[PDB]
Design a protein around this ligand. Structure first.
Ligand SMILES: CC(C)CN(Cc1ccc(-c2ccc(S(C)(=O)=O)cc2)s1)S(=O)(=O)Cc1ccccc1
Length: 234
């Protein structure tokens, strides 16, 4: 592929992200001052783990819907066989959601945007998993420190998804070609934006893996005893 086509892949990936980014960065940054009062935080802390779980399950499911929509708009993704589409999303969707979360994270006061306002990790106390929440907040903090742009998120999450080493792929060569093309796109766009410096500062692939694995473990435990059928975005 020529640099002209690489640049078109760049523009295409970034447009697909902007159409499926769920919350506008502009809104997130604007609402940073709308913070939960102490009474509001206490209101959340009094809820059952089962109520917080269902709210969290609703937000995660919805975030995942937007990630699936992003993938479907990704050049070449819909050209993969159905098995492979499923393999990639099953392995990668929740890792993308975790990356996407850094946009809603405010490093200045360590709060995150949740149901209309910004709250610290103590908001989630009823869930009884401080370590995981803390790990999620630290991970977001590490990404926010980089000032990850909207397009870097777009290109980086595309590569989280389009990973040819996911076990179970039936057309591994096709995923490899897609992955390589997206790598070209990412690297070229970092050059064009003078942002080469972020590559070495990005979280190791393994860290996103171990975090999502710990995350998924909680989800399974909650969703087993309390499934919730909730509306589809697209
Ligand atoms: C804020 C996190 C640490 C806690 N969870 C609630 C959220 C779920 C989805 C969120 C979200 C959705 C969209 C964006 S966006 C539109 O800016 O991309 C950003 C964040 S916050 S949790 O559910 O991940 C914590 C949890 C709950 C239950 C079991 C395990 C973990």
């Amino acid at each position: 592929a020529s640099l002209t086509e690489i640049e078109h892949l760049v523009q295409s990936v970034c447009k697909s992200y902007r159409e499926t980014c769920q919350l506008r960065l502009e809104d997130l940054l604007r609402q940073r001052s709308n913070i939960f009062s102490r009474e509001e935080v206490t209101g959340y802390q009094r809820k059952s783990m089962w109520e917080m779980w269902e709210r969290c399950a609703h937000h995660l499911t919805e975030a995942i819907q937007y990630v699936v929509e992003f993938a479907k708009r990704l050049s070449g993704f819909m050209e993969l066989c159905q098995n492979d589409q499923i393999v990639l999303l099953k392995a990668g969707a929740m890792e993308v959601v975790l990356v996407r979360m850094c946009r809603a994270y405010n490093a200045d006061n360590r709060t995150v945007f949740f149901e209309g306002k910004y709250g610290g990790m103590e908001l989630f106390r009823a869930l009884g998993c401080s370590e995981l929440i803390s790990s999620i907040f630290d991970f977001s903090h590490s990404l926010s420190a980089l000032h990850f742009s909207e397009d870097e998120i777009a290109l980086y999450t595309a590569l989280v998804l389009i990973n040819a080493h996911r076990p179970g792929l039936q057309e591994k060569r096709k995923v490899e070609q897609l992955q390589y093309n997206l790598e070209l796109a990412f690297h070229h766009h970092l050059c064009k934006t003078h942002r080469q410096s972020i590559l070495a500062k990005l979280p190791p692939k393994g860290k996103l893996r171990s975090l999502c694995s710990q995350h998924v473990e909680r989800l399974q435990i909650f969703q087993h005893l309390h499934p919730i059928v909730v509306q589809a975005a697209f």
